[PDB]
């Protein structure tokens, strides 16, 4: 197999046996074979909207099929064969719309020729010997390789956002347009140029997407808010819910309401906890456990059932006893969990078996006790703009460390929390996503009532902290967001992490550390394009990067 998209890929230059994070040989294979066959759907897509008659019908179908190949998102072989076949129908109905639009405007029939993506064809005994030959390793040059694999790693995180957002009734034709512009790019033999702008295109529409999901989320559910929240916990069995979905947050809340089972949060829907519109349940207790690969242990205490409504799943020990009452919904799969059918169009997922199950279950086991404060995200922030900036001028914060991102199970991930533990008393760290989880349990008190640790949110949530910079930079004068006293120190994990950091870039900031290790997938130079660019450098040791902060290098 070939893998290389997350930050855990084996010797950080690929997994080529058996992913680190568990995935088989077969599953990767068939998320190739999947991505190949969404190439073959942009190809003539991509051709429709040239030729001025646009087909939007595959829209959610090419989100939801790069969601699925995500990091810990989808396990179930099946799904990938089941995805496959309907992308070959899709693909072929989108054939024979252009091949008639072509002979109309043209006079003739089409005849030029195609990648294989558009034409290749068979049944699904015929998927695991090609998904073989239509991999990464297909692309030789390590340049052309590093850039359509960078462009489509960023584009599988932007998929997920706009999955979300799609969920929520809220959809730009951009965004859509964009999936298949940049997925048939990586059939096509382009210039270094064109391959980087097509990146840089990416970061940008990361910057729509995200911006759309806030809006979907805060319109939706109110703008997050100061809240604390209860890491300990209470004395009914419990559902837990994981990912982020926060559609799927609203549905079980309310199918939950009255039944004497609680619902807990977990992961990335540790932000649910700071919406107005779900702060109003009082089943809905808290927060359980910590990042998302210390599950198995969580998991299994939790007592409960539990709810996957996106990555990050990880497989089972053999030691491990929930996978009857794992739930998996959305683009998550995992053979032999159940899962939770798409709701339909006006109507809502039905979340009664959980329900049922959970009250067959014991309580959650208290794993600790406590509370995290969070919620401040760009509403928020900007409401204590005032105090915020009177504390820069005083002296009283001294900088801002932005260490937002995704989480990991490698040691060396306790440089973050030893950079936060460490930093001068007079900072304050701003989170988003479960990169938070490694410092957001200390005790790091607050600086005149401000925080010292600011939780915005999910990993899409960064897009608030983008918010903040860009209104201080107004607020200050500046003409550099760069001036402005913020460090970024981001850890990441999987494509969404990667997806954040292009709309950074788009952004314009510049000297961001990024790790705990550099992408696998950048050659050495397209490396140096994005150092040239953008200054992007590794992490160092907790102390020269805290000194080099402190002095805004
Ligand atoms: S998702 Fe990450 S750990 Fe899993 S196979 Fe790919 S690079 Fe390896």
Redesign the pocket.
């Known amino acids: 197999?070939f893998?290389?998209?997350?930050?855990?890929?084996?010797k950080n230059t690929?997994?080529t046996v058996?992913?680190?994070?568990?995935?088989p040989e077969e599953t990767?294979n068939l998320q190739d074979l999947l991505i190949f066959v969404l190439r073959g759907i942009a190809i003539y897509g991509e051709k429709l909207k040239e030729l001025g008659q646009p087909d939007r019908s595959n829209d959610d179908f090419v989100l939801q099929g790069l969601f699925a190949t995500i990091?810990?998102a989808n396990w179930d072989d099946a799904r990938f064969e089941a995805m496959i076949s309907e992308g070959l129908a899709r693909r072929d109905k989108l054939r024979n719309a252009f091949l008639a639009v072509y002979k109309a405007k043209n006079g003739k029939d089409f005849s030029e020729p195609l990648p294989e993506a558009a034409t290749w064809t068979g049944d699904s005994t015929a998927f695991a010997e090609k998904a073989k030959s239509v991999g990464i390793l297909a692309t030789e040059n390590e340049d052309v390789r590093s850039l359509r694999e960078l462009l489509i790693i960023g584009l599988k995180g932007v998929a997920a956002y706009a999955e979300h957002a799609a969920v929520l009734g809220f959809r730009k034709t951009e965004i859509d347009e964009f999936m298949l512009e940049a997925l048939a790019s990586t059939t096509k033999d382009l210039s270094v140029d064109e391959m980087v702008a097509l990146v840089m295109k990416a970061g940008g529409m990361a910057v729509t997407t995200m911006a759309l999901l806030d809006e979907a989320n805060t319109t939706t559910y109110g703008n997050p808010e100061i809240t604390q929240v209860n890491i300990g916990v209470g004395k009914n069995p419990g559902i837990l819910i994981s990912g982020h979905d926060l559609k799927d947050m609203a549905e079980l809340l309310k199918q939950t309401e009255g039944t004497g089972v609680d619902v807990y949060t977990h992961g990335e829907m540790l932000p649910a906890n700071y919406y107005p519109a779900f702060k109003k349940y009082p089943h809905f207790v808290g927060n359980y456990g910590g990042s998302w690969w210390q599950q198995n242990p969580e998991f299994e205490s939790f007592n409960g059932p539990i709810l996957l409504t996106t990555n990050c799943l990880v497989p089972l020990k053999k030691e491990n006893t929930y996978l009857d009452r794992l739930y998996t919904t959305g683009v998550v799969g995992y053979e032999g969990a159940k899962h939770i059918a798409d709701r339909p169009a006006g109507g809502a997922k039905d979340f009664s078996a959980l329900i049922a199950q959970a009250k067959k279950c014991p309580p959650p086991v208290e794993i600790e006790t406590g509370s995290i404060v969070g919620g401040f995200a760009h509403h928020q922030v900007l409401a204590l703009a005032d105090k915020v900036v009177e504390a820069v001028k005083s002296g009283a914060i001294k900088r801002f460390v932005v260490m937002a991102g995704c989480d990991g199970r490698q040691k060396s991930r306790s440089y973050y929390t030893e950079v936060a533990e460490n930093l001068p008393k007079d900072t304050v760290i701003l989170t988003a996503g479960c990169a938070k989880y490694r410092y957001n349990k200390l005790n790091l008190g607050d600086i005149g009532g401000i925080p010292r640790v600011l939780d915005a949110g999910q990993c899409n949530d960064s897009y608030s902290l983008a918010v903040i910079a860009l209104k201080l930079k107004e607020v200050f004068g500046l003409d550099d967001i760069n001036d402005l006293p913020v460090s970024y120190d981001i850890a990441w994990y999987?494509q969404k992490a990667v997806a954040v950091l292009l709309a950074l870039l788009f952004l314009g900031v510049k000297g961001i550390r990024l790790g705990p290790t550099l992408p696998?997938f950048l050659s050495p130079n397209v490396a140096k394009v994005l150092v040239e660019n953008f200054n992007i450098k590794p992490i160092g040791t907790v102390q020269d990067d805290i000194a080099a902060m402190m002095a805004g290098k």
């Open positions: 197999m893998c290389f998209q997350c930050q855990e890929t084996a690929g997994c058996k992913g680190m994070c568990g995935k990767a990091t810990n999987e696998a």
